[PDB]
Structure 1
Amino acid sequence: DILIVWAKDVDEMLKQVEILRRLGAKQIAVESSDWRILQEALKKGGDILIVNGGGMTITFRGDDLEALLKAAIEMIKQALKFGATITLSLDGNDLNINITGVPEQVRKELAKEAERLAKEFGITVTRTGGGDVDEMLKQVEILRRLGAKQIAVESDDWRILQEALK
Structure 2
Amino acid sequence: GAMGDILIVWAKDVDEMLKQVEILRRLGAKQIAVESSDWRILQEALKKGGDILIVNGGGMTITFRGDDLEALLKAAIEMIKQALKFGATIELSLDGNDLNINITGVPEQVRKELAKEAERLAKEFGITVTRTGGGDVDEMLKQVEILRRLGAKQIAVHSDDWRILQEAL
TM-score, normalised relative to structure 1? 0.75
Distance 1:69 1:28, change over 3 A: closer
Which piece of structure 1 moves more, 34-43 or 99-108? 99-108
Structure 1 pair 98–6 and aligned structure 2 pair: CA distance change class (3 A): same
Q: Which whole-Å deviations, capped at 9, do the CAs of 1:105-164 have from their partners, x for residues lacking one? A: 433332222222223334322222334122223322332333334444445233452389
Q: 2:154 maps to what in 1?
A: 150
What is the RMSD computed on CA atoms of the aligned residues?
Answer: 3.0
The unaligned stretches of length 5 or more in structure 2 are none
Judging changes above 3 Å, is the alpha-carbon distance between structure 1 residues 164 and 145 closer, same or farther for their aligned structure 2 residues?
A: farther
The structure-2 alpha-carbon separation of the partners of 1:27 and 1:79, relative to structure 1 and needing over 3 Å to count, comes to same
Aligned residues: 165
The gaps in structure 1 that reach 5 residues or longer are none
User: Structure 1 stretch 30-39 or stretch 106-115: which is displaced more?
Assistant: 106-115
Give 1:106-125 correspondences, 5 Å limit.
106-125=110-129
Task: Name the residue aligned to 1:105.
Answer: 109
Give deviations 1:10-66, integer Å, cap 9, x for gaps.
223223322333344333322222111111111111132332324322122334444
8 Å CA contact 2:33–2:50 kept in 1: the answer is yes
The alpha-carbon distance between structure 1 residues 11 and 121, as it changes in their structure 2 partners (threshold 3 A), is: same
TM-score normalized with structure 2 length = 0.74
